[PDB]
Each structure stands twice: as C-alpha cells, then as structure tokens.
Design a binder for this molecule. Structure first.
Ligand SMILES: Nc1ncnc2c1ncn2[C@H]1C[C@H](O)[C@@H](COP(=O)(O)O)O1
Ligand SMILES: [Cl-]
Ligand SMILES: [Cl-]
Lengths: 140, 142
C-alpha cells in the first residue's frame, strides 16, 4: 500500500469550502493524506504542470482556472491509490460523473471540475516531485 | 457582526493517524471558517519546544513536546468572524473527558495528552503562532 498519487483540490472547490468533505472521500476510502499544502500557483507553474496539454485548445483554460485562486495540494497514499483516487473523482466532465463522486457532488462544469488526480504511475511520480520534496512527504 | 480574525489550528498526530483530517476540516468549514493556509509537517523537538515556550517551566511540558513530535501533523490558518473563539468552541474543552458532545475533542480525542487539536487562545498568541508556521505570502485570504 505504498503507491502514491498527486491530488489537487482546485480553486472552485476551495472557494466552496468543501476541502474537508473531499478529504473525507479520500480518507473514508482508505487513502492516507501523507503530504499537503495550500498554495496559489503562478501562471508559469500551472503551465509546467499542464505541459502535456500545451498544444490543446483547452490549455489556456486549464491554466486560468488553476491560478484563479488558492488550491489545496496533497499526496494520497495507499493500495491502488492512483486508480482509487480516479474512481473517487469521477469523470472529467461532471455531467458524466457517477452519482456520489467528487465531481458529481462538487463540480459546476468541466472547467470548474473541483479536483485533479494523477492519471498513471509516471505522472504520479512527476507531479508529486513537482510540488513536494520527499522530506515533506510522510508515509504512515 | 464581529471582527474577522485568523487563528492557528493544528490537527495533532493522534488525529492525523485516525485519518479524520477531512472530518475536522468540515467542522471548521461548516461553522463558516475558511482554510486560508495549510501544510502537513513533522515538527522537530526544538520547534515543538519553541511553540510551547509558555509552558516551559510546567510539568506536562515534556509530554506536550513528545506528543506533538510523535508523528505528522496538519497545520492550518482558519479565518472568519470571531475565528479564535469559534475554533475554541468547536475544539471543546482541553480535557476530552470534559468536552461537550459534538466537539472535536469529544469525538476524536482519546485523552488529555492525545487531544486531537490545538487552537490559538487569544489574539496575540494567534499572531505569534501563525507567523511561526507560515510566511504571509502563503496565507491566502478569501
Ligand atoms: N471592519 C472590519 N471588519 C472585520 N474585521 C475587522 C475590521 N477592521 C478590522 N478588523 C479585524 C482585524 C482584527 O483581527 C480584528 C480586530 O481589530 P484590531 O484593530 O486588530 O483590534 O478585526
Ligand atoms: Cl486536471
Ligand atoms: Cl496544544
């Protein structure tokens, strides 16, 4: 159960003051919050984070929405963490997300879709390393 | 209407281990307080000692320090109307035995040593405790 994934509670969900409810989704599902911080990303950092989408027409929108306000960033650890977090988040478009997922419950739109989660083992590694030094990640 | 205040909150290692960070956060957020800074940390002995200096000559001091450093904690700044007192009412009495039902300490604390949470007790300690753990550039009022 040492797999880790990178989660972000996006500015829309922070602004709703539902950080705790989203955290409980993780915790109740058996994931442990092993690193965490509130931050306000710069444009340059949002651009780096979303680099893989630099050529897509929704790039500017991913970026603008991620820097519109503070975010809560955390590392989630546990068995099958990457896929479990994805299951908890639900579909990218909240209109398509299953009932009781984070996006179905807290997302207003595909832009304001509440949360990010790493999509694969290598993106989890890169994203965790982007936001946290290992000395500030506390496995337990 | 009262003064918008910031206070310093810590979810102690007992409650982090319980995986009830979310539940405690929702206590704050449902009471109309906003999380305006946060980070997970593992305090050093020295940092815990500094933080608890007001209790340095007391006999529970060593225990306060060893318990604060026994595992990672979740630290946050809470902002809202009357935040200092509000947080304290939500936490409940220092001794979970004495804490009203529905408080954080009643629901998540196992004892006076393992008592789940800290909150600043006054405006001046709030100021000092926030500055101890966060630079202002990482506190984001909204
Ligand atoms: N208009 C208004 N609304 C809400 N909160 C306010 C206002 N003016 C100051 N403050 C804040 C600043 C302090 O935390 C507290 C008392 O002000 P202090 O001067 O520090 O004793 O209230
Ligand atoms: Cl995303
Ligand atoms: Cl304390």
């Amino acid at each position: 159960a040492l797999e880790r994934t990178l989660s972000i509670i996006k500015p829309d969900a922070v602004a709703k003051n539902v950080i705790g409810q989203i955290y409980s989704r993780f915790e109740n599902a058996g994931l442990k919050i092993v690193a965490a911080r509130m931050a306000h990303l710069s444009r340059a950092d949002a651009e780096k984070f979303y680099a893989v989408h630099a050529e897509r027409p929704f790039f500017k929108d991913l970026v603008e929405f991620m820097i519109s306000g503070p975010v809560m960033i955390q590392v989630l650890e546990g068995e099958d963490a990457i896929l479990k977090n994805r299951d908890l988040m639900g579909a990218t478009d909240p209109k398509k997300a299953e009932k009781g997922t984070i996006r179905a419950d807290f997302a207003d739109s595909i832009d304001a879709n509440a949360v990010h989660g790493s999509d694969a083992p290598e993106t989890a590694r890169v994203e965790i390393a982007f936001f946290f030094p290992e000395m500030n990640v506390y496995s337990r």
